[PDB]
Amino acid sequence: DLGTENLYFQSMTNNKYYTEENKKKVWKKHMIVLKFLEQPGISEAYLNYLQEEIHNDEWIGFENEFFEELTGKPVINVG
Amino acid sequence: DLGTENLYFQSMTNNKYYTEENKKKVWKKHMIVLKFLEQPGISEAYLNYLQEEIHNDEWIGFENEFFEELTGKPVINVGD
């Protein structure tokens, strides 16, 4: 709803919480969302979102990750 | 489309790739998707997805994370 800040997101900006417990939790919740993004309709809406969001200068420090998502590059590096 | 597996997903199942480089990359791509999920429409579709997916026995070892997503719990644990 209008005017709310996403406290859960703001937590992820603070290196204090970048612990081994939370990195594992995020990795697994990411795998969960990845399967949602395969759903008909959602993939196309996600890409539309990415095309707008890459212009948003609030995402400073995320340039490589955005480029990768925007271009359909692997989620992780397999070496 | 039919019969393809998500090779990117399958990589994430192998502990060989659970490196500090990839954990950081995943954390940031997760933050990117989190803002997408705030978009009108998407939030409701995600929850509908979760309600089906929790019965999918293929997600063994993910029980706590699913429960948390299904019930709107914090993405990460902030102690305090």
Author numbering:
A (entry chain A): -10 to 68
B (entry chain B): -10 to 69
Original authors' sentences:
Here we determined that the arbitrium system in Bacillus subtilis phage phi3T modulates the bacterial toxin–antitoxin system MazE–MazF to regulate the phage life cycle. AimX also inhibits the function of phi3T_93, a protein that promotes lysogeny by binding to MazE and releasing MazF. In all structures, phi3T_93 shows an identical all-helices fold composed of a longer N-terminal helix (α1), followed by two shorter helices (α2 and α3) connected by a long unstructured loop forming a V-like shape. The α1 helices of two phi3T_93 monomers interact, resulting in a W-shaped tight and globular dimer that displays two shallow grooves, one across each side of the dimer molecule.
We obtained the structure of phi3T_93 alone (wt and its N-terminal His-tagged version; His-phi3T_93) and in complex with AimX. Interestingly, in the His-phi3T_93 structure, the N-terminal His-tag folds as helices and are also accommodated in the dimer grooves replicating the AimX contacts, supporting the idea that the phi3T_93 grooves are specifically designed to accommodate a short helix. Size exclusion chromatography coupled to multi-angle light scattering (SEC–MALS) analysis confirmed the phi3T_93 dimeric organization in solution.
